[PDB]
């Protein structure tokens, strides 16, 4: 299946250069147009540019002097560099396969012919925070079960920066009953979040939350017990 | 903007400026916590996996706005929707149209859960009370904390809820936690207030 996976630093300081990679499987990069798209928190997507091995490539004018897009055929990846970043560049960044279509009329309407692009396969996205604040890894604590025949149970992921943190349960073998809350940005300027699972109260299965904070290369497995 | 609709009914979502030239409109759907995904291209063509409940207004009558219609709406359709406009008489749009949030009123009252500090946090000389609030609509709550009967003036951090679920955290020292008889999380929602309490 065509599958795109973006990666990046999570945190970049103002004035630095943002460098992102989009790892591609299930198709060869030379055979597609590629777009990068970004979406700030609470806002709509903004198209950064599209690139093709042919040279049929174009950049968003507002970013023109700061952006570079590339394809690496040997490694089958797509790259972005964005220079002189500021807080306005904070967003989730996405890689997408980009298909091309044409609106074609009678020759009497030739001036109105045009091409359009649509993004048909997107990656999961990589979060980019441009901030002068330093990275901080989370502290992870278990939220012990105590009390319908069902109990709740969770993990507290405390005081990290920047976003995001991913939490899974039993490495992915528990996605039902699961609610991972959106993070709170605290007055300290650090984030915290919690994830909970709902389970039947009766000493079978083991419950472990797996927390990963990519920006700080932190991975924590936390067993949660009564 | 926002559009709310009952399950089974028809939703319509408007996006972009009034048309000038011939049009090709692309629509994307974004589910909470997910990437946008393509829903419609070339005004009314659908990619693989998209049912004919979703339809786009022709790139047609001059001076009109593009609309996405969703018939027989289900709760799975709840999402943000964005269009990307191609208009033969305008420059390329590098920003998508402003999004619209589709609300599906399946229908409301919050589930609240309140955790004491973990032994492990206490062993690190810290303490956090965790008040989890979920499964409520509409998405307005206020949270207040009590120490015994006294209002807490400090250490509270509470999320703005999103698609609803919300969290409130009370940071305390271990001796503050052990001192009082109890602490309470009070959740105020649609005229009512739900309280849960926790004690050493």
Author numbering:
A (entry chain H): 1 to 82, 82A, 82B, 82C, 83 to 100, 100A, 100B, 100C, ...
B (entry chain L): 8 to 9, 11 to 67, 67A, 67B, 67C, 68 to 95, 95A, 95B, ...
Question: What did the published study say regarding this structure?
Answer:
Identified from African donor 17 of the IAVI Protocol G cohort, the PGT121 antibody family consists of three primary members (PGT121, PGT122 and PGT123), and additional antibodies from this donor described recently. At an IC50<50 µg/mL, this family of bnAbs neutralizes 65–70% of HIV-1 isolates and also recognizes an N332-sensitive epitope. One of the main characteristics of the paratope is a 24-residue HCDR3 that forms an extended anti-parallel β-hairpin with either a type-1 β-turn at its tip for PGT121 and PGT123 or a distorted 310-helix at its tip for PGT122.
